[PDB]
Amino acid sequence: EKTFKQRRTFEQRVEDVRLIREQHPTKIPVIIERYKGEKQLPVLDKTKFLVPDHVNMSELIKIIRRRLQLNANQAFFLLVNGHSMVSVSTPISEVYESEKDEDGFLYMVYASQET
Amino acid sequence: EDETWEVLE
């Protein structure tokens, strides 16, 4: 199936970010998708997410692991620009400004093997 | 098509 960037045009994505940030100024707009070809981890039902500004990557990883109903022992990586974040205590509002895409979304992919 | 958002907290 097509990725989010392939299902929505660039100009549609830009406009959506502008409008959703007006409506929810304390939330960060995040696209979360399963890594291409990943089979151990399941698919999320939705693609577009709103994350409160204060949530850090450690907390977000916990949230997503719970949403996927993962076992505590199994590997899981949340990749922002193809790599795991090591500064897991910084709030996502700060991650957003450094790592957002050209379209204004913050893109994440999750995988089960070597980040 | 699905334009909705899920809130993560």
Tab-separated table of C-alpha atoms in Angstrom:
chain	number	residue	atom	x	y	z
A	1	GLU	CA	0.000	0.000	0.000
A	2	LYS	CA	0.988	3.647	-0.449
A	3	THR	CA	2.658	5.658	2.292
A	4	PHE	CA	1.067	8.805	3.737
A	5	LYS	CA	3.220	11.031	1.540
A	6	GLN	CA	1.978	9.139	-1.516
A	7	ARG	CA	-1.705	9.252	-0.481
A	8	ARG	CA	-1.786	12.998	0.203
A	9	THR	CA	-0.192	15.637	-1.987
A	10	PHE	CA	2.528	17.926	-0.696
A	11	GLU	CA	0.231	20.940	-0.805
A	12	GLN	CA	-2.539	19.002	0.971
A	13	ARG	CA	-0.095	18.043	3.759
A	14	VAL	CA	1.180	21.603	4.171
A	15	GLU	CA	-2.384	22.928	4.475
A	16	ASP	CA	-3.385	20.198	6.924
A	17	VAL	CA	-0.488	20.988	9.254
A	18	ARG	CA	-1.257	24.705	9.163
A	19	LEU	CA	-4.914	24.127	10.028
A	20	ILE	CA	-4.380	21.457	12.698
A	21	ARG	CA	-1.769	23.562	14.488
A	22	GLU	CA	-4.304	26.424	14.657
A	23	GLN	CA	-6.922	24.125	16.230
A	24	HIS	CA	-4.564	22.314	18.606
A	25	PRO	CA	-1.679	24.611	19.497
A	26	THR	CA	-0.381	22.422	22.331
A	27	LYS	CA	-0.184	19.288	20.158
A	28	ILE	CA	2.495	18.126	17.698
A	29	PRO	CA	1.293	16.565	14.368
A	30	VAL	CA	3.007	13.190	13.899
A	31	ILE	CA	2.784	10.586	11.120
A	32	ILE	CA	3.555	7.111	12.511
A	33	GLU	CA	3.949	4.192	10.092
A	34	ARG	CA	5.341	0.700	10.198
A	35	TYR	CA	8.734	0.322	8.582
A	36	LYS	CA	8.613	-1.025	5.026
A	37	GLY	CA	8.554	-4.826	5.105
A	38	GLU	CA	8.292	-5.177	8.891
A	39	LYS	CA	6.373	-8.283	9.941
A	40	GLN	CA	6.979	-8.939	13.656
A	41	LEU	CA	5.245	-5.732	14.784
A	42	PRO	CA	1.581	-5.175	13.818
A	43	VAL	CA	0.051	-2.307	11.852
A	44	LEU	CA	-1.546	0.661	13.599
A	45	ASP	CA	-5.145	1.383	12.645
A	46	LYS	CA	-4.428	5.094	12.076
A	47	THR	CA	-1.614	7.162	10.549
A	48	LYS	CA	-2.063	10.763	11.778
A	49	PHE	CA	-1.448	11.489	15.452
A	50	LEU	CA	-1.539	14.470	17.778
A	51	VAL	CA	1.014	14.349	20.608
A	52	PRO	CA	0.985	16.788	23.560
A	53	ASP	CA	4.007	19.090	23.615
A	54	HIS	CA	5.366	17.740	26.918
A	55	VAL	CA	5.585	14.090	25.851
A	56	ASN	CA	9.159	12.913	25.383
A	57	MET	CA	10.379	10.058	23.196
A	58	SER	CA	10.713	7.652	26.102
A	59	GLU	CA	7.051	8.256	26.992
A	60	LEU	CA	5.983	8.055	23.337
A	61	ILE	CA	7.735	4.723	22.910
A	62	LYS	CA	5.851	3.417	25.946
A	63	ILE	CA	2.558	4.726	24.507
A	64	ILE	CA	3.113	3.090	21.128
A	65	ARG	CA	4.304	-0.200	22.600
A	66	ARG	CA	1.085	-0.317	24.632
A	67	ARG	CA	-1.041	0.613	21.603
A	68	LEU	CA	0.567	-2.255	19.620
A	69	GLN	CA	0.021	-4.595	22.625
A	70	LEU	CA	3.660	-5.674	22.562
A	71	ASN	CA	5.245	-8.024	25.050
A	72	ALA	CA	7.697	-6.358	27.414
A	73	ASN	CA	10.704	-8.334	26.194
A	74	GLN	CA	10.434	-7.765	22.469
A	75	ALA	CA	12.513	-5.320	20.482
A	76	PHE	CA	10.997	-2.105	19.221
A	77	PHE	CA	12.573	1.013	17.682
A	78	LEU	CA	10.851	4.413	16.906
A	79	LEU	CA	12.837	6.030	14.107
A	80	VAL	CA	12.508	9.773	13.390
A	81	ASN	CA	14.775	10.369	10.383
A	82	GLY	CA	15.693	6.718	9.948
A	83	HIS	CA	17.413	6.459	13.329
A	84	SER	CA	16.596	6.018	16.983
A	85	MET	CA	16.740	9.130	19.140
A	86	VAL	CA	19.170	8.958	22.040
A	87	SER	CA	17.995	12.154	23.809
A	88	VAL	CA	14.800	10.485	24.960
A	89	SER	CA	13.966	13.033	27.670
A	90	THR	CA	13.525	16.088	25.432
A	91	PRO	CA	9.894	17.088	24.815
A	92	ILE	CA	8.409	16.400	21.409
A	93	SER	CA	7.684	20.087	20.897
A	94	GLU	CA	11.455	20.584	20.775
A	95	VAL	CA	11.976	17.453	18.643
A	96	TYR	CA	9.378	18.818	16.213
A	97	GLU	CA	11.254	21.997	15.443
A	98	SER	CA	14.532	20.182	14.722
A	99	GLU	CA	13.152	17.165	12.868
A	100	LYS	CA	9.920	18.055	11.082
A	101	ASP	CA	9.613	17.398	7.355
A	102	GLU	CA	9.336	19.996	4.634
A	103	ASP	CA	5.560	19.596	4.816
A	104	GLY	CA	5.416	20.357	8.572
A	105	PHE	CA	4.646	16.876	9.797
A	106	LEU	CA	6.983	14.969	12.087
A	107	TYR	CA	7.486	11.514	10.534
A	108	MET	CA	8.214	8.383	12.549
A	109	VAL	CA	8.545	4.723	11.567
A	110	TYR	CA	8.716	1.737	13.837
A	111	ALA	CA	10.718	-1.432	13.384
A	112	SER	CA	11.776	-4.489	15.350
A	113	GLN	CA	15.419	-4.814	14.217
A	114	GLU	CA	18.583	-2.655	14.603
A	115	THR	CA	16.975	0.782	14.546
B	1	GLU	CA	-10.789	8.907	3.033
B	2	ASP	CA	-9.732	9.086	6.682
B	3	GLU	CA	-8.696	12.629	7.654
B	4	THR	CA	-9.065	12.032	11.412
B	5	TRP	CA	-6.380	12.219	14.116
B	6	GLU	CA	-5.670	10.043	17.128
B	7	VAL	CA	-4.409	11.720	20.306
B	8	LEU	CA	-1.434	9.959	21.975
B	9	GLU	CA	-0.839	10.565	25.705
